[PDB]
Design a protein around this ligand. Structure first.
Ligand code: NA
Length: 369
């Protein structure tokens, strides 16, 4: 079985079919959006039909745009002619050949590539506590019909078009970086002896839903007790277009049950799983889609190609493990400050790997249960 997604214009003249809602970037390359457009021959007579792919950044709205009330900067734009048929006939892909075999003679292929310099789907709606507005990067697939008027004004009527917001989803590349690790030491006021914290991760990339084994070694040479060992996954978000908004938020947390007495060491591995489901509040963190939708995830770590300016990504997402130690008799007495350290890591979807029967679903995404 193969689920095909479809949407049809208010006026019934144009119907678009897609194989996926979600298009894979493994960063070596990215999936093209290939699909077909079914037309009503009678409603498209004398008309042209195109499909465009637009990547845009928007600040100030959850979409572009109501009352032109938002800032917008386009990252990429492409458009192909789907009807009348251009040049040679037939599909360039099996999906297309198959969908055309099934749907019949009013169906026409279209294929839209992605380039390698774009970000992946990212959006944020701010929490009450935050300032700065909603923003994100949208990927629009639009199929529309144009016609001519005797006044020589061409027309692109809304009722003849269909707009699908797809996702460009980040999947892991062939290779990952070295084992993440960090070593911090503190010498407190009046003290001759160090508190050391080493922290290590099993690998530099993790998959959404994959448990992250944070291993911690405390060497406490001090007279103090470490009352608490806390471990966080922090999501760090930078808005690099328009407003400068900066967000850092805890998407996962774990507390050890153990303390570290003066003059002792402790080594323990805590396991964290940074999912959006763990978060009651979905606001003020970078997601790959709208809050309302069941399929939405945490944004994957941004990946910038060499030689691309980061502002052109429009929102930067990155992750770190933060380990905070709580030290007895310090705070308000020997420090106004945290004792903590961070180890960065990347978070994305799994590495991808290396006729049929179709079932048609409406493209609109399922709302949150
Ligand atoms: Na001490």
């Amino acid at each position: 079985n193969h689920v095909i997604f479809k949407k049809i214009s208010r006026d019934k003249s144009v119907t678009i079919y897609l194989g996926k809602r979600d298009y894979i970037d493994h960063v070596e390359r990215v999936e093209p959006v290939d699909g077909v457009v079914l037309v009503d021959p009678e409603l498209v007579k004398g008309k042209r039909v195109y499909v465009s792919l637009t990547c845009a950044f928007r600040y100030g709205q959850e979409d572009i745009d109501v009352m032109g009330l938002s800032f917008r900067r386009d990252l990429y734009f492409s458009q192909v002619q789907v009807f009348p048929p251009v040049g040679a006939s037939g599909a360039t892909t099996r999906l297309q050949e198959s969908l055309i075999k099934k749907l019949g003679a009013n169906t026409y292929p279209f294929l839209l590539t992605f380039p390698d310099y774009l970000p992946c789907s990212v959006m944020l709606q701010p929490a009450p506590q935050d300032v700065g507005k909603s923003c994100g990067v949208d990927f629009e697939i639009k199929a529309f019909a144009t016609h001519s008027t005797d006044v020589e004004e061409d027309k692109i009527p809304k009722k003849s078009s269909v707009r699908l917001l797809i996702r460009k989803v980040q999947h892991a590349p062939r290779d990952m970086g070295p084992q993440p690790r960090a070593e911090a030491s503190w010498q407190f006021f009046m003290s001759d002896k160090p508190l050391r914290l080493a922290v290590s991760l099993s690998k530099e990339i993790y998959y959404h839903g994959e448990p992250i084994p944070v291993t911690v070694a405390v060497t406490n040479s001090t007279e103090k007790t470490v009352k608490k060992i806390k471990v966080l996954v922090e999501q760090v978000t930078n808005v690099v277009l328009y407003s400068s908004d900066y967000y850092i938020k805890t998407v996962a947390a774990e507390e050890a049950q153990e303390k570290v007495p003066p003059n002792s060491s402790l080594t323990k591995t805590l396991t964290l799983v940074p999912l959006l489901a763990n978060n009651r509040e979905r606001r003020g963190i970078a997601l790959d889609g709208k809050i309302k939708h069941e399929d939405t995830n945490l944004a994957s770590s941004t990946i910038i190609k060499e030689g691309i300016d980061k502002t052109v990504m429009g929102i930067l997402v990155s992750y770190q493990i933060k380990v905070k130690l709580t030290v007895s008799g310090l705070l308000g007495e020997l420090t106004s400050s945290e004792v903590a350290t961070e180890v960065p890591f990347r978070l994305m979807h799994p590495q991808p790997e290396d006729d049929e029967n179709f079932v048609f679903e409406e493209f609109a995404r399922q709302n949150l249960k």
